[PDB]
Design a protein around this nucleic acid. Structure first.
Ligand SMILES: [Mn+2]
Ligand SMILES: [Mn+2]
Ligand SMILES: [Mn+2]
Ligand SMILES: [Mn+2]
Ligand SMILES: [Mn+2]
Ligand SMILES: [Mn+2]
Ligand SMILES: [Mn+2]
Ligand SMILES: [Mn+2]
Ligand SMILES: [Mn+2]
Ligand SMILES: [Mn+2]
Ligand SMILES: [Mn+2]
Lengths: 87, 95, 106, 97, 97, 82, 106, 95
DNA sequence: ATCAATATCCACCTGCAGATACTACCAAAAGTGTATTTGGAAACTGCTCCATCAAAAGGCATGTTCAGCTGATTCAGCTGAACATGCCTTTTGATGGAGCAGTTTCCAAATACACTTTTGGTAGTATCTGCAGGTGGATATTGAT
DNA sequence: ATCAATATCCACCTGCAGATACTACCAAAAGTGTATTTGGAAACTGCTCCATCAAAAGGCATGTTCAGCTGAATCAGCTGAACATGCCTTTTGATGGAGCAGTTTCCAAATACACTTTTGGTAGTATCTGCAGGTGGATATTGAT
C-alpha cells in the first residue's frame, strides 16, 4: 500500500445547517450562536464511547473490519439499543 | 455458505392474520426481527436470574410467566400471560 | 407427526425457541412448557405491534408497513413506548410535537 | 421583495423535519469523522458501510432526543432560544456528566 | 429577643444533613405506607425488617438525588426556591415521565 | 384524629430530604408533589419485589426480593445481601 | 497440595470463583485461566476501594471503616464513581456540596 | 444452618495487607460483599455475551480481559488488566 | 464599628453494642490423579463487499439587514422561613406464635441417545406492484397595508 | 378587513426498485421412539424473627409575622433568522482485490468422574475496645444597634 490521506478536523464536516436540521426535528425554534460548537463537542463524546466499545469487539474477534454487529452490541452496552441492523 | 435464521416467515404469517392486505418492507421486517430477538433475550434473562435467585436449575413455563410479569407493563402483561397459559394448556392436552 | 407449534396452535416456532433457550445458556434444564409459553408471548407481542403499525400505514394511505409506521405505532401507544423506552428504531423519525410557547400570536 | 418574519420559516422547518425520517447529516462527512475517531483508537481498521450507517442512525437519534430535552430546559428558563447552558443542564440531569 | 434571618438556618441545616447519613423519615409512618402500597399487589403480606430498611434507604437515596436535579432546574430559571415544575422537569429529562 | 398514610411522610421529613440534597428554599406545593413521586417510586419497586415473593411461594417480602427489584429498576443497592 | 490462590499469589479464592463461573451459566465451558484472572481483578478493586476508604477513615480520626467512608471514598474518585454511577451505598449520605448562588451575600 | 458464603474473610485479608491497623464494621463489610458480587456478575455477564457473539463454548482469560476493558473506566481498566495478567503468569510459572 | 446571643469547636470521659479472639465441628468445597472427549487454532482458499476512483448532481458558505428576543433594571406584593412546646405519634423492648427454612422422600419429567422424517434457508431465475418523485393547478397561509 | 406572494395540498400519472413468485436442493433442524436419571414438589416441623402492644420517649403541628424572593412590567441593545448570492463537495454508479468467512484437520485443554484432604462457615462461650454521646468551656458566627 502506497499512501493513505491524513484525517484531521472532520468534526467540522458536521455543518451548521445539518445541526440546525437536527434541532428542527427535535422541535427547536431558536438557536444561539454557540450551539454549533457545543453540539459538535457532544457528538464527539458520544461517538468516542460507541466506537471504543465497537472497536473493542472487533479486536476481540480478531478482525480488521468493524461490522454492524460490533456497533449494535456497543450500542446495547450503553443502553442505546438499535433495531434494524441485524441486532 | 452459512444459514442465518430470522423470524421473518413467522412475522409475515402473523401480519397476514391481522391485516390481510398489508405488506411489510424488508427494513421494517429487519426491525421486527430485531424486536423478536430483543424481547426473547430480555425474557430469558429475567427467567435466568429468577431461577438462580431461587436455586433452580430448570427454566419452566412458571419462570417464563414471572419474567413476563417482571418485564412487560400493565396491560401487555395481563394479555401475554393469558396467551402464554392458553398455549401451554392447549399443548399439555395435545399429546 | 404434528409440530409442537400446532399442538399449541401457534405460528411462532416452538421447536426453534426451545433450541435457542438451550444454546443461550440460561439454565441447566429447560422445561418443555417454557418454549411454548415464550413462543406465545412472542407472537402476542408481534401481533400487537403489527396491528398498530398497520393502522398507521392505513392512516397514511400506504399499503406497505415501513419503519416510520412502527415508530408511530410504538410511540403513540403508552405501553409499547415504555417496553421500548430505551430502543431506537432506525428510520422511524419522531412524533410531530411543537411546544405551545413556540407557536405565534396568542 | 417578500420577507417571512423571524420564526416563521423555522416552524415550517420543524413541521417539515418532524414529518420525515431521512438522515439529516451528509453521509461522507459523517463517515470521515467516524474513521478519524476510530483511527485514533486503532490504526488500519475498515468499516462495513452498514456499521457506519448504524452509527449514524444512533447518533442522530441521540442528538434529536438531546435537542428536545435542551428545548425543555430553555423553555423552563422562560426563553425560546436554546443555549449551551441548556444542553449542559440536560446532560447533567441525564447523568452523562 | 433573638431572630435568625431567612435561609440562615436553612444553610445551617444543609450543612448538618450533608455531614450525616441517618434516615430522615420516621420509620413507622414509612413502614405503614410500604404496607399499604403492597396490599394492592398481594394480601396478607409480612415484611422482613431489613426489607423495609432496604426500601427506606433506596427511597431516601432516590429523593435526595432528585432534589439535587430539582435544585439545578430551579437555579436554571434564576430562582432559589424549588417548585413542582422543577421536579417535573427533572423527571421528564430522567425519562421517568 | 385519623390521617392518610402518605401524609405520615411529613413536611419536616420532606424538608430534611431536600436539605441533604442542598436545597435552600422550598415552595409549599412541593410536599404534595414529593409524596406523589415517592408513591410512584415505591409502587414500581414493591410491585416487582412482591412478584419475586409470590414466585418463591412465600408470604414475607425478603430483603433479597427488594434488592433484586431495585437491581432491575436500574437502582442497585449495596448493603443488604446478594 | 498447594491452593490456586497461593499459586497465583492472591488472597481471593480462585476455587470459589471457578465454581461460581460454571454454576452461573455464563458458558458451556470455563478455561483454567479465567478464574485466576477474574479473582485477581476482584482483589485489585477491593484493594483500591479499601485503600481509599481507609484514608477517609484516617481523615475523620477513626480506625474502623464504616459505610460513610466507602461512600466518601467512591464519589470523591472520578473513576470508582463512574463504575458505581448507578449504585447506592446504604448509609452513605452525600458529599458536602452547596450551590454557590445559595451562599449568603458577603 | 445452610451454609452462607460471603467474601468477607478475603475482604478482611486484603484490608490488612493495605491498612493493617484499620478495622471494618459489618455494614461496611456487607457493602463490600455486595460490591464484590456486583462486579463479578458484570464481568462474568459481559464475558458471557462476548463468547456467545463469537460462537464460542468457553469463557477464557481472553474473555475476562476484554470484559474488563468494556466495563472498567480508563485508569481502572489498565491496572486491572495488568493485575490479572500478572496472576495468570504467576499461576502458570509455578509447579 | 461594639456587643450580646447562641451555635460550633475541641478536649476529655466512659459504658456498651458490636467488634474480636478461640475452640469444636463437620459437610461441603477444593484439590489431586487417571481416562476421555472436543472446542477451536492453524492452515488453505472461495468469493462478498470494502476502498477507491471518475463524473454527475445539489446543498453549503457567506454577508447584509433588522425583527424581536434576551438580559438588565425596578418594584410591589405574596409567600415561605423562623419561631416555642406539650400533645400525641413513634420508638423501644418484651413476648407469643406464623412461616421460613431444614430434611426427606419419591415420581413426572428431565436428559441422553439412535435412526426418520420434515423444513427453513438460499440460489438460480422470472414476472408483478407500491410508491417515490415529477407534473400542473386548485386551496391555504402569511405579512404588507 | 383585502390584496398579493409564495408555500402547500392533493389527486392523477410513468419509471422502477425492491417485493413477491417458483423450482430445486439440502443440511440441519425437528420429530419420533426407547432407555435412564433426577429436580424439586410435597409434606412434615424446628426455631427464628415478625406483628403486636405497653410504657417510655422526643419530634411535629400549630398561627404569627415580615424579610426577601418571585413575577410583572419596561426597555435598550444586539444576536440570530431570513435571504440573496457564488460555487465546492457530496452523491452515485462502476471495479480490482483484501479479508471475511467456509471447510478440514488434530492436539492442547476441558470435562468427568473418583478418592483424599482441607477449609470456610457456624456456633458456643468468652473477651475485648472504638467511639457515640456526654460534659465544660473557649471561640466563632450572626445580627442588633
Ligand atoms: Mn488521528
Ligand atoms: Mn471440533
Ligand atoms: Mn459572497
Ligand atoms: Mn414591599
Ligand atoms: Mn406453622
Ligand atoms: Mn420449504
Ligand atoms: Mn409523492
Ligand atoms: Mn434429588
Ligand atoms: Mn486475500
Ligand atoms: Mn478453618
Ligand atoms: Mn462525639
Amino acid at each position: 500500500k502506497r499512501h493513505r490521506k491524513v484525517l484531521r478536523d472532520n468534526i467540522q464536516g458536521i455543518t451548521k445547517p445539518a445541526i440546525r436540521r437536527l434541532a428542527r426535528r427535535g422541535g427547536v425554534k431558536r438557536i444561539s450562536g454557540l450551539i454549533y460548537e457545543e453540539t459538535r463537542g457532544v457528538l464527539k463524546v458520544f461517538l468516542e464511547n460507541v466506537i471504543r466499545d465497537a472497536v473493542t469487539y472487533t479486536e476481540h474477534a480478531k478482525r480488521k473490519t468493524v461490522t454492524a454487529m460490533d456497533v449494535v452490541y456497543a450500542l446495547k452496552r450503553q443502553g442505546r439499543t438499535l433495531y434494524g441492523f441485524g441486532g | 455458505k452459512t444459514r442465518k435464521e430470522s423470524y421473518a416467515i413467522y412475522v409475515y404469517k402473523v401480519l397476514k392474520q391481522v391485516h390481510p392486505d398489508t405488506g411489510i418492507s424488508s427494513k421494517a421486517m429487519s426491525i421486527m426481527n430485531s424486536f423478536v430477538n430483543d424481547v426473547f433475550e430480555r425474557i430469558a434473562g429475567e427467567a435466568s436470574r429468577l431461577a438462580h435467585y431461587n436455586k433452580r436449575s430448570t427454566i419452566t413455563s412458571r419462570e417464563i410467566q414471572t419474567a413476563v410479569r417482571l418485564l412487560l407493563p400493565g396491560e401487555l402483561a395481563k394479555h401475554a400471560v393469558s396467551e402464554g397459559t392458553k398455549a401451554v394448556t392447549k399443548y399439555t392436552s395435545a399429546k | 407427526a404434528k409440530t409442537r407449534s400446532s399442538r399449541a396452535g401457534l405460528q411462532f416456532p416452538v421447536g426453534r425457541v426451545h433450541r435457542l433457550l438451550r444454546k443461550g445458556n440460561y439454565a441447566e434444564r429447560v422445561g418443555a412448557g417454557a418454549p411454548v409459553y415464550l413462543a406465545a408471548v412472542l407472537e402476542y407481542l408481534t401481533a400487537e405491534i403489527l396491528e398498530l403499525a398497520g393502522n398507521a400505514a392505513r392512516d397514511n394511505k400506504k399499503t406497505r408497513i415501513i419503519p416510520r409506521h412502527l415508530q408511530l405505532a410504538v410511540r403513540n401507544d403508552e405501553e409499547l413506548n415504555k417496553l421500548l423506552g430505551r430502543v431506537t428504531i432506525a428510520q422511524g423519525g419522531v412524533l410531530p410535537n411543537i411546544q405551545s410557547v413556540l407557536l405565534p400570536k396568542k | 421583495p417578500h420577507r417571512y418574519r423571524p420564526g416563521t420559516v423555522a416552524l415550517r422547518e420543524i413541521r417539515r423535519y418532524q414529518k420525515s425520517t431521512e438522515l439529516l447529516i451528509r453521509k461522507l462527512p459523517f463517515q470521515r469523522l467516524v474513521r478519524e475517531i476510530a483511527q485514533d483508537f486503532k490504526t488500519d481498521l475498515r468499516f462495513q458501510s452498514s456499521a457506519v450507517m448504524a452509527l449514524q442512525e444512533a447518533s442522530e437519534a441521540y442528538l434529536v432526543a438531546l435537542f428536545e430535552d435542551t428545548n425543555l430546559c430553555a423553555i423552563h428558563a422562560k426563553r425560546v432560544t436554546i443555549m449551551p447552558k441548556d444542553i449542559q443542564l440536560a446532560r447533567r440531569i441525564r447523568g452523562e456528566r
